[PDB]
RNA sequence: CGGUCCCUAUCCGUCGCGGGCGCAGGAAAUUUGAGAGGAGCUGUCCUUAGUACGAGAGGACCGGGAUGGACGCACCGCUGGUGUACCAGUUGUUCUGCCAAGGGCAUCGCUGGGUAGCUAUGUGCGGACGGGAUAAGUGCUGAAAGCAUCUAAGCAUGAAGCCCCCCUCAAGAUGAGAUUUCCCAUUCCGCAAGGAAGUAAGAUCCCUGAAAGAUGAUCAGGUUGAUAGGUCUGAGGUGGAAGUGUGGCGACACAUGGAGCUGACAGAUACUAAUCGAUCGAGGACUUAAC
RNA sequence: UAGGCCCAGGCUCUGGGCACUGUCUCAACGAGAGACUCGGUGAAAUUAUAGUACCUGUGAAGAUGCAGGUUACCCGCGACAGGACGGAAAGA
């Protein structure tokens, strides 16, 4: 099925979205290994979205991508980022645009660290 | 799942017209009460369509009488000898249970025709 | 499921309008019926001008249940109230007529007495 | 006595000749082969040790390899053995298909029910402790063989049977009879 | 719900014979020669 | 002279699950069964039969044959239940600059449906057919007591008792059983006894997970590979998306178009992650007898 | 967010009828908190010592510790509530 990660139903999708964000922006993230474990698939989900690159998937993804400036140089939103961007560095893998990398134990509660990127 | 589709394939019928949850059928269920095969014929509204694959299964809703029927069938059934679509119903749904306590002219609402 | 307490409709001339289940005959823990079972019943509403008076306790069938009935083929049927017929003694009517449809279960059981004035049996 | 070992794949319906429905399991079995008679002389009693469902050259050991070249077949993942079968009329290396059965034979089925941990003692023993539930051996008997499929290596019989998708189950003739 | 007794020393320390640590799964990193845990990072290792 | 109750309850006890060592080499599988537990139930109808019997009225015993109920065990193919990361409609307010389209909050805001899994009220099956020794009893033959006598000696029958037949557990059964297959008898110290070190067959750590699961455990896999995610194609569910165009003063309707969307289900596909590694693990005592 | 109705008598009480329901026949699934595993921190009542089985007897109250027998490899984790000579109680 899939994890509850301790938080309740809202929680929960605010914190993958959050995430996910997060990861378009920065390229590179340091979050818990279960936390990454769940985002992967979302993050996925949302780049095979992007490589379409029609206004329904457009609006598809801007109904769950959070409203952020990916660089202020350009004056580029993290949803033009994923439409423009990514989709043109994907443009030939099939699936699996995320890698997982295990750190070692957090010193403040023991959890397990990780980090997820973009290939 | 696709060993049981061709283990099921061979009794699968093909004489069935295309009907959705909302359209009135006239069915022709085979009765052998006193042996001497006789043709029942049944007249509703089509209430559901759940199922898939062979044991895909349809109710049909009518009103004899006062006293509101109804018939659940297996849609691959040998008892079932031919179907016929009388009407075509304009439907924003596909589980009709709503009117199962609706009466007579708020029920006949639905004779909106497609 | 027709329980004790479960208040049915009567489909006959009987007079009764009514009734409310005493006891399920049958078996000896058996709680619940279904088509084709004979009850003990309370009438609790009458007409004033019928065969049976308001009060008595009488035996009735089990003729029409919103619970369905499956059959071999596979097939169900289900109605929209529960219904009960008056019956005396032996599997006979206590009523001339019988108003709205009956289950064709009530024929495998030996009651085509009732079956016969049915207006139509399904 | 007659058996054979397969797998469970799910559950269907066929409708018969009088047209009625009846639930049906679906059990796909493979040729399985006699892997070693046991005698009265040698073993104490006499049985023939069925091999089912062979498996990758990796996922065997040695001794594996070797317990199964009299037989002269690749290692298999599941070994039974029965009891009370004629021990003649089968060899060490021969193949036992299903058709050792027909439609309308009476047979026992053998598996394992799915587990469901740790349950209580209401769900348990209906209120005698909680306790780890499932996961046992069951039979049931008496179940009535539906039809036979020689190419594809199917068993269709009548009603539930215990243990998850994708299972060993064991068919034999019936006991009681 | 309350002990009756007090517990001797021989009996606790039979029923702490359980409570230990394990060893960590450790290699060596190719490059350097470094030690982490099996199926984790280092790169800088 | 009964009641309560309250830990969870340290301790004994009872239930479930592990770790260690043992079982004269080290291993991987398949098993016998000393012993233990479970099962043991009922209602109507058809027959014998309107039969024996009974003045009539009334009316069996036994044996068969159907159909229910309760209980027990399994399972989700069917009828339903739930299904808080599935689909849709809708109120208030607020936000993404605006329109359109969407997000947040209000018990999952409310309402209509529902995949997988788990379920009963649902479905399948069971309690059968038989054998053995008996107790109380009914008996044959027969002495004491020339006869007779259930009995003294000897032979029968005999019950929801009992033991086997059915189901399950079971070699820590220290009495530690049996069968098949694999590895072989290495190097050092110590004359001997014995002790260390690399290994063999084989496993484990670690990692991907679920048909398993409180945690251990169990099971499927670890780059000559489909274990999980992704992708592609499907199954089922909901039900006619966005944009554009048309009709209407407008709320809206129609076409494009079984359209869009889709968690736990199936098949392909090494695209991502199961990398490299490390640890453990034999060299087979003595006696007698048959060879 | 925010009262269930109707017909009665007695001035609020007793009623009666209807509606409605997990109160139950009879329970099932789902959500959260604790329980459970991991990292950090960390008490209290109680306590003659203790390597603390069961049965049948014996016995100043009721035997773990007395006699005779029967069973039982060593150490844990999670449950139960049987004993708990636990506390509540209360009759009296």
């Given at each position: 099925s899939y994890r509850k990660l301790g938080r309740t139903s809202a929680q929960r999708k605010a914190m993958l979205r959050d995430l996910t964000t997060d990861l378009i922006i920065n390229e590179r993230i340091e979050t818990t290994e279960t936390r990454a474990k769940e985002l992967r698939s979302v993050v996925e989900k949302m780049i095979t979205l992007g490589k379409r690159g029609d206004l329904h998937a457009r609006r598809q993804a801007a109904a769950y991508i959070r409203n952020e400036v990916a660089n202020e140089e350009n004056n580029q939103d993290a949803l033009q980022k994923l439409f423009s961007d990514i989709a043109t560095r994907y443009?030939?893998?099939?699936?699996?645009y995320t890698r997982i990398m295990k750190l070692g134990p957090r010193r403040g509660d023991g959890a397990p660290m990780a980090i997820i990127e973009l290939v | 799942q696709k060993l049981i589709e061709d283990i099921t394939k061979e009794q699968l019928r093909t004489d069935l017209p295309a009907f959705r949850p909302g359209d009135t059928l006239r069915v022709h269920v085979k009765v052998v009460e006193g042996n001497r095969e006789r043709i029942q014929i049944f007249e509703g509204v089509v209430i559901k369509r759940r199922g898939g694959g062979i044991s895909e299964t349809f109710t049909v809703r009518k009103i004899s009488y006062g006293v509101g029927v109804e018939r659940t069938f297996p849609v691959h059934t040998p008892k079932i000898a031919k179907i016929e679509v009388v009407r075509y119903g304009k439907v924003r749904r596909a589980k009709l249970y709503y009117l199962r306590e609706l009466r007579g002219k708020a029920a006949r609402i639905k004779e909106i025709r497609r | 499921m027709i329980q004790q307490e479960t208040r049915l409709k009567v489909a006959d001339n009987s007079g009764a309008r009514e009734v409310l289940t005493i006891k399920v005959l049958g078996?000896?823990?058996?709680?619940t019926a279904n088509i084709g079972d004979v009850i003990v019943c309370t009438v609790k509403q009458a007409t004033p001008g019928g065969v049976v008076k308001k009060g008595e306790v009488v035996k009735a069938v089990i003729v029409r249940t919103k619970s369905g009935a499956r059959r071999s083929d596979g097939s169900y049927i289900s109605f929209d109230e529960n219904a009960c017929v008056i019956i005396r003694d032996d599997k006979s009517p206590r009523g001339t007529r019988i108003f709205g449809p009956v289950a064709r279960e009530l024929r495998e059981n030996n009651f085509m007495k009732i079956v016969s004035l049915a207006p139509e049996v399904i | 006595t007659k058996g054979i070992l397969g797998r469970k794949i799910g559950m269907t319906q066929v409708f018969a000749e009088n047209g009625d429905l009846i639930p049906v399991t679906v059990i796909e079995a493979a040729p399985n082969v006699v892997l070693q008679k046991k005698t009265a002389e040698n073993d104490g009693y006499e049985a023939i040790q069925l091999g089912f469902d062979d498996k990758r050259?990796?996922?065997?050991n040695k001794p594996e390899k070797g317990h199964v070249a009299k037989a002269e077949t690749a290692p298999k993942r599941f070994v039974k053995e029965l009891r009370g079968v004629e021990m003649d009329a089968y060899e060490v290396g021969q193949e036992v298909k299903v058709e050792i059965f027909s439609a309308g034979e009476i047979v026992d089925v053998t598996g394992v029910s799915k587990g469901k941990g740790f349950q209580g003692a209401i769900k348990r023993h209906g209120q005698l402790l909680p306790g780890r539930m499932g996961g046992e051996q069951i039979t049931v008997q008496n179940l009535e063989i539906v039809k036979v499929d020689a190419e594809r290596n199917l068993l269709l019989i009548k009603g539930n049977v215990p243990g998850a998708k994708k299972s060993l189950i064991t068919v034999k003739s019936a006991v009681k009879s | 719900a309350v002990p009756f007794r007090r517990t001797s020393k021989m009996k606790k320390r039979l029923r702490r014979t359980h409570f230990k640590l394990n060893v960590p799964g450790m290699t060596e990193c190719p490059s350097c020669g470094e030690m982490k845990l099996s199926h984790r990072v280092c790169k800088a290792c």
């Open positions: 443009e030939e893998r099939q699936g699996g | - | 078996g000896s823990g058996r709680k | 050259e990796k996922l065997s | -």
